[PDB]
Amino acid sequence: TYHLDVVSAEQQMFSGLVEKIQVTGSEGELGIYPGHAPLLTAIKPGMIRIVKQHGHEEFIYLSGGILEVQPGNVTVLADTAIRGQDLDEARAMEAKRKAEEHISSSHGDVDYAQASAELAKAIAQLRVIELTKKAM
Amino acid sequence: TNVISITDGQIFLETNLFNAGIRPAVNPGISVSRVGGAAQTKIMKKLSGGIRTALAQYRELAAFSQFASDLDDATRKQLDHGQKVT
Amino acid sequence: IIYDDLSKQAVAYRQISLLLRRPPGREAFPGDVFYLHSRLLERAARVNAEYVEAFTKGEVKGKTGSLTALPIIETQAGDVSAFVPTNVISITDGQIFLETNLFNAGIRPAVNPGISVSRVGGAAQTKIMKKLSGGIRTALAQYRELAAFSQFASDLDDATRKQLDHGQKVT
Amino acid sequence: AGAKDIRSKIASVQNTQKITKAMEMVAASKMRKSQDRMAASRPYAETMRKVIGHLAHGNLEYKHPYLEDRDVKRVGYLVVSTDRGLAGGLNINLFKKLLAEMKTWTDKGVQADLAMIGSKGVSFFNSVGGNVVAQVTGMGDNPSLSELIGPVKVMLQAYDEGRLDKLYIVSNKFINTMSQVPTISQLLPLPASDDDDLKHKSWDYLYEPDPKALLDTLLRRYVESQVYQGVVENLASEQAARMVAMKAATDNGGSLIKELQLVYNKARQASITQELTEIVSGAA
Amino acid sequence: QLDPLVVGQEHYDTARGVQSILQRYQELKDIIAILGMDELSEEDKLVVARARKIQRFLSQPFFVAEVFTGSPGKYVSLKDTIRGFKGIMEGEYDHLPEQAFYMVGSIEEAVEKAKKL
Amino acid sequence: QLDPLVVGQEHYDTARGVQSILQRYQELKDIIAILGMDELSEEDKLVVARARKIQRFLSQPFFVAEVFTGSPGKYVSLKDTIRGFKGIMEGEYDHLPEQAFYMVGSIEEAVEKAKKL
Numbered sequence: 001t002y003h004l005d006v007v008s009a010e011q012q013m014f015s016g017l018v019e020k021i022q023v024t025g026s027e028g029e030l031g032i033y034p035g036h037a038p039l040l041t042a043i044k045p046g047m048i049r050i051v052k053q054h055g056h057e058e059f060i061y062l063s064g065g066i067l068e069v070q071p072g073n074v075t076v077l078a079d080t081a082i083r084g085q086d087l088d089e090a091r092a093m094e095a096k097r098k099a100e101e102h103i104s105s106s107h108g109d110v111d112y113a114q115a116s117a118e119l120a121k122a123i124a125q126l127r128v129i130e131l132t133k134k135a136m
Numbered sequence: 137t138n139v140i141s142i143t144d145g146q147i148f149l150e151t152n153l154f155n156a157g158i159r160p161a162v163n164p165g166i167s168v169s170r171v172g173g174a175a176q177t178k179i180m181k182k183l184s185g186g187i188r189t190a191l192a193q194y195r196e197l198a199a200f201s202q203f204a205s206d207l208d209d210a211t212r213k214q215l216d217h218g219q220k221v222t
Numbered sequence: 223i224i225y226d227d228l229s230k231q232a233v234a235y236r237q238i239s240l241l242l243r244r245p246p247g248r249e250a251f252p253g254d255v256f257y258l259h260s261r262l263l264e265r266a267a268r269v270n271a272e273y274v275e276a277f278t279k280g281e282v283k284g285k286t287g288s289l290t291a292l293p294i295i296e297t298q299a300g301d302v303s304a305f306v307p308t309n310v311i312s313i314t315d316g317q318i319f320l321e322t323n324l325f326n327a328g329i330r331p332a333v334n335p336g337i338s339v340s341r342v343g344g345a346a347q348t349k350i351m352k353k354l355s356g357g358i359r360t361a362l363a364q365y366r367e368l369a370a371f372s373q374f375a376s377d378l379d380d381a382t383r384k385q386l387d388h389g390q391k392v393t
Numbered sequence: 394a395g396a397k398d399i400r401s402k403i404a405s406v407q408n409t410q411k412i413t414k415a416m417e418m419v420a421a422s423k424m425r426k427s428q429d430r431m432a433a434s435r436p437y438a439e440t441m442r443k444v445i446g447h448l449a450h451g452n453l454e455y456k457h458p459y460l461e462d463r464d465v466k467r468v469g470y471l472v473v474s475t476d477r478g479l480a481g482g483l484n485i486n487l488f489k490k491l492l493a494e495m496k497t498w499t500d501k502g503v504q505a506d507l508a509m510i511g512s513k514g515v516s517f518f519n520s521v522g523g524n525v526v527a528q529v530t531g532m533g534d535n536p537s538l539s540e541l542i543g544p545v546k547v548m549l550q551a552y553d554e555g556r557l558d559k560l561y562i563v564s565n566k567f568i569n570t571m572s573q574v575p576t577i578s579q580l581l582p583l584p585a586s587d588d589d590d591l592k593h594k595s596w597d598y599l600y601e602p603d604p605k606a607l608l609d610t611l612l613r614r615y616v617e618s619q620v621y622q623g624v625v626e627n628l629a630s631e632q633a634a635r636m637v638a639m640k641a642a643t644d645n646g647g648s649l650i651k652e653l654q655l656v657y658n659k660a661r662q663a664s665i666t667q668e669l670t671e672i673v674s675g676a677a
Numbered sequence: 678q679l680d681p682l683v684v685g686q687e688h689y690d691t692a693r694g695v696q697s698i699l700q701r702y703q704e705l706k707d708i709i710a711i712l713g714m715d716e717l718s719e720e721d722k723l724v725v726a727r728a729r730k731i732q733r734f735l736s737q738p739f740f741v742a743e744v745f746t747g748s749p750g751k752y753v754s755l756k757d758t759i760r761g762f763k764g765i766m767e768g769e770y771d772h773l774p775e776q777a778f779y780m781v782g783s784i785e786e787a788v789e790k791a792k793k794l
Numbered sequence: 795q796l797d798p799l800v801v802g803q804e805h806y807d808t809a810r811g812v813q814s815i816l817q818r819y820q821e822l823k824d825i826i827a828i829l830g831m832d833e834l835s836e837e838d839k840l841v842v843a844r845a846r847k848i849q850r851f852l853s854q855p856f857f858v859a860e861v862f863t864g865s866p867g868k869y870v871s872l873k874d875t876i877r878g879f880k881g882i883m884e885g886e887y888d889h890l891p892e893q894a895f896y897m898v899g900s901i902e903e904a905v906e907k908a909k910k911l
Contacts (some may be wrong), residue, residue, distance in 0.1 A: 009437045009538045009618045010430075027602055040444070040598040040607060066611065068444060071596070075440055079614070080540040088546050095527040095543030102514045102519065104529030106208065106712045107476040115374045115416050116203065116479065117707035122197035122409045128402055129823040130654035131394070136823055155817040173745055194894065200710060202825055205516060205835055206478055208713035246672050248665055375414040379422070409828065480833045520836065642829050649827065 001053045002034045005075045006060060013078060014050065014060060021074075022049040023067060030067075039069040045082060067098060145169035158222065163187075165195050187221060194218020223266070223289060228259060229296040232306050249305040256309050259293075263313050266291035316340040329393065336363035358392065365389025396664060399657040400634040400667075403650060416479075417639035421636050423534065424632035428567065431625045445615060446588035447598075455605055458553055459583055460613050464466045465558040467504035469548050470495070470577075471620060473564040473627040474514030476533055480631050481638040483565060484513050487575040491563050492521070494577055506557065508544040510624060536624045538617065549613060552581055553583050564623040565630035571637070573630040580619055583612065691759050694766050702728035705726055723771070730765055733778040734787070751782030760784065811883050812848060819845035840885075847882055850895035868899035876889045877899065877901065 004021065006014035023030045026042045045063045052058065067079035081087075129136060140146060147167050154161035173181050197215045200207055205217065225231075225240065234250060239252035247253045268288040274284050293314065295307050302308065311317060318338050325332035336359075346354045369386055373379065378386070429571040449460060470491065474484050495505050509515045518525050527544045551557045560581035567572050600607060681689040705717070705725055714722065715743035740750030764770055770787065777791035798806045818841050825833065826842070834842065857867030879900030881887050887901065894908035 005436070007437050007440070009614075010433065012436065014595065014629055024546050025601065036633065038596050038598045040448075041600070041601040042607065042610065057300075057629075060748055066607070066614070068440075068598075076514050077437055077441060077614070080537070081542070083542075085583050088542055091543040092527070092546040095529060095547055098529070099509075099525050099527045104515060106716060107512075107533035108513065108532050108535070108716065109477060110708060110712070110716070111374060111376055112416075112477050113711040115412060115419075116206065116477075117200075117711055119409065119412050119416075120203045121199045121707070122405055122412065123825055123828060124202070126402060126405060126824045128649060128653065129827055130820065131399065131402065132649070134652060136827065151820075152817070155813055156821075157814045158818075197710070200687050202822075202835075202838075203478065203833075206711060208709075208711065211710050227474075243676065245676075248669065250672060291431065370411065371415050371418065374412065375419045375422075377422075446871050479829070479833060481830075483838075486833070517836070638830070638832070645830075 002032075002072060002074060004050070005073075006048075006062070006078055007075065008078045008080055010080060017053045018074075019051040019053055019055065021051070024048075024075075025067065032069065036069055036074075038071070039067070041067050043067050043076070048076070060101075094114075144171055164191050165206050190214075190217055194222070223291050225262075225291065225293045227294050228310065229294075229306060232258070251305065255306070256313075259306075259310055260313055263291060263293065263310075265289065303367050315342055335359055335366070362389060362392065365393070395587055396583070396657060396659060396660045397535045399653060399660060403657060406649055407654065410643055410650075413639045413643045413646065417636055417643065420632050420636040420639060424629060424636060425571070427534070427625065427629040427632050429623075431567065431629050434618070434622050434625060437624060438615070441611060441615050441618065443588060445583075445608075445611055446551045447590040447593055448604060448611065449583075450585075450588070451590055451676075452594065455608055457605075457608060457612065458495045459581055463558055463580055465503060467506065467557060468495075468498055468559045469508065469551065471508050471544065471548060471560070471562045471623075472510060472514045472518075472622055473562070474509065474511030474517075475627075475631045476511050476513065476531065477631070477635075478513075479635055479638060481634045483573075483575075483631060484517070487563065487565060490575050490577065506548075506551070508548055510541070532624075534628065536621070536628060541617065541620055541624065545617050549616065555621045557581075562620060564627045565586045566632065566658070566667065567626050567630045570633055573633055574590055580616060644667045678691075688755075688759055689765075690739055691763050695762055698724065698728045698766060702732075723768075726771065726775075727765060727768070729775050730770070730773075730778050731762065733775055734761065734765060734781075734784075736778075736780050737782060738780050748780065752787075753783050757783050761787075804880075805872070805876050808880050808883070812879055815841065815845050815848060815883065840888075844882060844888070846892055847887075847890075847895050848879070850892060851878065851886075851898070851901075852881060853897050854899070855897050863897075865897060870899050870902075874900045878904075886892070 001017040001019055004014065004016060004018040005012070017035075021032045023032065024044045024046045026044055030041070036101045043062065043065055046061070048060050048062055050058050050060060062076065063081055064083050065076050067076050068074070145168050148163040149161045150163045151161070153159075169175075176184070193214050194217070197211060197218065198216060200211075201215065204212070207215065232255060235255065235258055236251050240246070240250070244252050247255065266289045268286060271284060271286050274285055274287055291308060295310055297307055298304060302311070316339050319334045321332045321334035323332075324334065340346070344356075347355070365385065366389070368382065369389065372386060449455060449457065454460075472487075472491065474487070480525040498505060505524060507518055507523050507525045509518065509525050509530075511532070515525065515528050515530060527547045529540055529544055532540055548557065549561055552560055559579065561577050561579055563577045564577070566576045567573050678684065679689065679692060684692075697748050701724055705721060705728075708717070708776055709725070714725075717725065737753065738748045738750050740744065740752075764784060765778075770784075773787060773791040774794060778787050781787045781790050795801065796806060797808060822834065822838060822842060831839070831842070854870065855863065855865045855867050860867060882895075883903055887905070890904065890908045893911075896902045898904045898907055
């Protein structure tokens, strides 16, 4: 068997020893058995099939990525969203827009919000440094 | 405490407000007048109610002024209207 | 015996002293205000069988008498340090501190652990209770600060979430 | 003054000390988790950089614009900033390092373009009149690669279009729980970074369809991934800085209590003396 | 006198409900300041809306303040007070705007006033 | 005597500006004491940096105090000091270290003292 890693930029999706995989490579569907010669290809979105050793199959869904193969290593640099000149341009347009209208979304950290609010209210009109005679 | 008990109202003059530039230094949040609205001209009676509320909301929000940049514009509007009326 | 609000006997004594021009003391309570509550509370005692047998001239021989006292005091907004409350805290063998925050929050009786204590300790406690309760006190004393850390922290370690659940159960 | 004011102030400062100690605890846990997410990024970038080692530097090479060291007429920066305050000087040290270097660049007459991650830098450079071309904000403590695609896409699109000649990322580096450092590091043109595939002369890939098409997306994804790594290291560095700052603030509060209680005791004694002298010398 | 045995469970529960709703709105005000309204959950925004409507509804015009405001005073019987606060907390009036509750007096007058605003 | 009628507009206005800055600096000393100087807004750091200069520039060496400090005394004319404070407030000496202002005469002895550290 061969060692397969499925890894995203954010996290690792799979690791293990595998009997075969079936993969929708860009220029037509592909299959990797052991000892497969060194190869490098982009892939389309869809279910990859994994056959783990002792035959235990499992599926994984990939949104794209690059498949790469070496003597005993195969890895799939998956990625987290559909990547395509159609979508990336929309993202970049929104990012440019927000630079113009000067929007800012609030962070979602409700705990920092509450802590900072209580801190601001507790520290207000404390006037301590006038009361303790500390010079500063 | 005796004369605060006898009279009908109080004008509290604050030395901090007087230093910060606010002159006359009347402290609106603890000054009172128990004859109140009854004694004004009705134009003033009409118009000053909103100043009361503008300053009350400003005094409730003011604690955040030292973290203001973190605030939300929905309150930044009030927190600037308070400063402008003051 | 239960004295309801010695805090008011002190005041009545202050009045009936100042009416007699007897010279004042801190907070205006007359000089010997400590010796007012002291010579009272020191009668609550457990007296051994030889004092009983002497006092009663033999009529009862085995027994030990006793007189427990539960005085009540009334602080001003939780100020334990006021004059009379700290006099009495210095005379007695413990205190049950009733906390306004817990009482309003619905925790009735609002006993406040940690700051309340019985200095005779388990010697007074029946055996089964000394066994079962030996942990409760400090476990709750810790839970009440752990649940005060809670509010500024979602995403709690469940090694502590078990604790905040148990403490909430028992409370 | 008077006992009943100072005891109220002491109470409020003790409450403040509770707040800041809780925040120190929270930040100390989030640093551990953010550094775990930091260490969950290395594999992707490292393997992709080995692949680019083989494909681009190689024993034969492919002309790509991102590799060549063309003339500099204007420079882009990707700026990482926190979304939350109380971080200590972290943002302002970073912005001053950036501003010093951007001054040094504009002293050769080159313009500069900024893409902002995080809202604090957005506000700062709106104030100092920087040239912010794109921004993303509100990622908070959940950075994700998909949100970063926007600005990095803009900066790539402008680089290949010749509108930019060099591209930097500017961010903090987490080193120790007690020490982090602001850094400016180049990412286009791609640095020369060893990874000599001479050893790997033994083999070569079957490219499908062709090496140039693959190499283009490999470099695009690699730049995106280095921006993501920088965002996560900055997040972990923010959590470390907030932890040490809240520690300092809790000890400051703990000293202010020592001052206030001496003032309080003095007032207690003076009020007892002036009460008792008013009573006694008011007899007879 | 505020305990179930004397006021009845209906009254006691309505009172504790109003207290709970206000006490949670106090928590929420300082999230709303820092983060703005939109980050709240759907029931948090509904709690805020009911808490404001209760806070407004506790106001009332007095037959003796009639000289200061001019507006004629109202008398509200206890039945109508409980039925109003329970109906607000149960959401029976979530469709009226907040100003409709201010100074009306009884809850039917809230329902009437909401039309003209 | 501190009236526009008496000292003229410019002097009165400078004095009141100095008071306003120093008061705003007092209002910050508690937050600075607790949380440190880094949590201030970017414009408050400037208020603080100017107040800490105004405090020093209010210092002066006295002819009678040569006994204590050696440094020779200075006489500063009014015309020559309202100009210096108007300058510091308007931020035109805002590139000079604090200790440049400590124990000097007019603002030109400060601008000189900065060169020598």
